Amino acid sequence: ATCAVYGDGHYLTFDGQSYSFNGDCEYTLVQNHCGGKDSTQDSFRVVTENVPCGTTGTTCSKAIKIFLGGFELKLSHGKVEVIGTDESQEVPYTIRQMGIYLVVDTDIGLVLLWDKKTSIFINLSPEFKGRVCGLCGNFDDIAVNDFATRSRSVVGDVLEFGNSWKLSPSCPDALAPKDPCTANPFRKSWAQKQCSILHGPTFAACHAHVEPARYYEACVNDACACDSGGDCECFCTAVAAYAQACHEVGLCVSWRTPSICPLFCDYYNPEGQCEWHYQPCGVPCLRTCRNPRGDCLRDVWGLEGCYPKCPPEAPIFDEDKMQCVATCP
Amino acid sequence: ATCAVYGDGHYLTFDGQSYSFNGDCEYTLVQNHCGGKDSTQDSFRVVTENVPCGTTGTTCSKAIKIFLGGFELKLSHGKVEVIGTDESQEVPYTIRQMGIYLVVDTDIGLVLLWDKKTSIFINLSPEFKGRVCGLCGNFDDIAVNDFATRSRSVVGDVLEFGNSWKLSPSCPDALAPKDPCTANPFRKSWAQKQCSILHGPTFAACHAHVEPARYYEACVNDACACDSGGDCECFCTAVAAYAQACHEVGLCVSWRTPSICPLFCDYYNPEGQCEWHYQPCGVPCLRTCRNPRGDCLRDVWGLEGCYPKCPPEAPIFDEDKMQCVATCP
Ligand SMILES: [Ca+2]
Ligand SMILES: [Ca+2]
C-alpha cells in the first residue's frame, strides 16, 4: 500500500486505484480521526498546494505542509522551514536526505518521500487500516470503496470527489483536463521518442510483473503538457515514478544514461577525492553518526541517487558536513 | 582569429565581425583557391547543412561534410562516417574525441571542433592570410571588408551575402528572422532567469575583458526560440559558446552546477574504479598511445568536459578502449 502523487494529477491510492485529478487549491492527503473519531491518538494532517505550471491548465505540487500535532512544517524551494514552532513539545520529525529524496519520517508509522520538485510517496502502517480518510482513500484493501468523500459516502464521480476535499472555501470548483498532445501536436514526436524507453528492452523484466501502459500514457501526456522551460524535469519525474513503482516490488532496474535524464554526482566531491557514486538499487543500509556501523535500520523500499562511498579510512559517514568521519562526536 | 558558428545563426568571422543569418540549404564555410587561384596547394572545402528545428523558422547545423582533397567525411548523429573513400592516398584526418568536442585535425594547419549537437569552431593558420574565401570572410585582419562575396565584392547587405554562398541552385532565398521572444512571450521569464547567469558574479572576471551583452542577447533569443523538446541543449550550447569565447583569451571559468547544465562523467566508470573527473579549464596535455608520456603537444585552446584521470598504476591512457594501460602495443 503506497499513496503515490507525482507529475500532473497522477494519484494512486493505497488499495491500488489509479485516476487523475487537477485543481488549484489546498487539498488534504491523509487525515486522522475523520469525523471527530478521537481514538486516543494524535491527529496528523498532510496538505498540499497546487499552482498552474504551463499553459493548458495542468497542475503540479509546489509546496507541501505537514500538521503533526502542534507542529507545522513547510516544504518549498528544496528546503524545509519550521513554521508552527510548537512550545514545550518534542519534535517528532526526523528530516533526512537520501538519494534524490528528502525523506521525512514520523513516530507514528508514517513516512514521506519528496523528490524536491513535484513527486511525493506515502506509506502507512497496517494498524491504521480502516481508520484513515482523505484523498488517498480509506485504507481497507478494497478498490471499489476508495472513492469515499468527507461525508463517508463512496461516489463513482472523480471530479466531485476531488473537489470535496478542498480546504479553502473560496477557490472555485475544479474542471476536467484537456488533451495535452492535442494541445501541443508538434511535441508529439519528441514526446513519444523520449517516452518509448518504457517499452524498450530496459523494462523487459518489469513487463512481466506490472503493466506499463498506464505509465506510458502518463509519460506521453506529461511530455506533451510541459511547455515552459524545464521539460527535462517533466520527463525525468514521469520516468522515475515508474522506476520507483517497479522498485517497490523488489527488482532493481538501471536506466540513467548520460544522454537521457543525467545526474551529476561528482560536484559534491572535493578536490582530489572521489567518494560519490550512483546506485540504481539504493543502499540498503549505511553508517552515519546517528546509525552506528553495526546498526543498519533497513526501512527503505529501494531508492536511487548519488550516495557517498566512504573510503576504508573513516568508513563512517556524517550526513551533516557531507563527508566521512572516523569518529562521530 | 576563430570562426565560430553555434546555436541558431550565430557567426563570428576571423577578424572579429559578428552577425546573424538563417536559411535552409548547403553553405560553404571555408573555401580554398577561390576563383581558381591554384597557389600550388591542395583545395580544401567545408560545407554545412541547415534544417529547421522549431516552429518560428530558426535554423541549426545538423550535418557537416568536409571535402579535403579526394576525401569526403560525414558528421551526423554524434559519429563520423567516411563517404568519399579516396583510393591510393593517405588519410590526412586525425579524428579525436576530447572533452565534449569531437576534434578533427588536418595536416594543413586547419582544426575543427564539434560539440556533436550544433556548435562548430574553426581556427586557421596565419600563413593563409588574405587567400581564403567563404562565409567566414576573407582572412585579412580587417573587419570592414569581411563581407566579400563570391564575386570578390564587399557588400554591406547580410542576407544577400549569406544567400550568395549557397551550393544547391534550387533552394529558395533566405528570409529575415523574426523575434523569438515576441513569438513565445510565455517563455520570456524562464529564459531570462536561466540566461541571467551571464550577468551574475560567475563571469565577473570575464566582464572586464569581453562584453557579454551580445552573448546575453544570443542566450535570450536561443531560449525563446527553442520550442520543441530539448531546450536544455538550446541553453547549454548558448552558455558554452560564451564559455569557450572567454577561454580563448586565457582565463578559466567554472560554471557547471548539478542544477544548471549538468554533466554525467561517472557513467563511463566501470564497477569499483573512479578515474573520470570534470576539468573546466581542460587538460593542457595528457598521455596516450599516440602521444607518449614525455610528449604533450599542447595545441588546444582550452576545452571542457569529462576527462580520464589515470591512476598512478598504468598512468598512460589508450583512447581506444576508454581506459588507462601501462604499455601501449
Ligand atoms: Ca477502499
Ligand atoms: Ca575582412
Author numbering:
A (entry chain B), B (entry chain A): 901 to 1229
Sentences from the paper on this structure:
The two gel-forming mucins MUC5AC and MUC5B constitute the main structural components of the mucus protecting the underlying epithelia in the respiratory system. We determined the cryoEM structures of the wild type D3 assembly of the human MUC5AC mucin and the structural single nucleotide polymorphisms (SNP) variants Arg996Gln and Arg1201Trp that affect intermolecular interactions.
In contrast, the Arg1201Trp mutation, placed in the β1-β2 TIL3 loop, only affects the adjacent residues. The solvent exposed arginine is substituted by a tryptophan pointing toward the VWD-C8/TIL interface. The tryptophan accommodates into the VWD3 hydrophobic interfacing region in close proximity to Leu1013. However, it represents a reduction of 35% respect to the WT. In the closed conformation it establishes a novel interaction between the TIL3 domain and VWD3, and the open conformation removes the possibility of a putative salt bridge between Arg1201 and Glu981. On the other hand, the presence of the tryptophan interacting with VWD3 could affect the TIL3 flexibility important for the interaction. Nevertheless, we found that the Arg1201Trp SNP could favor tetramerization and thus net-like formation.
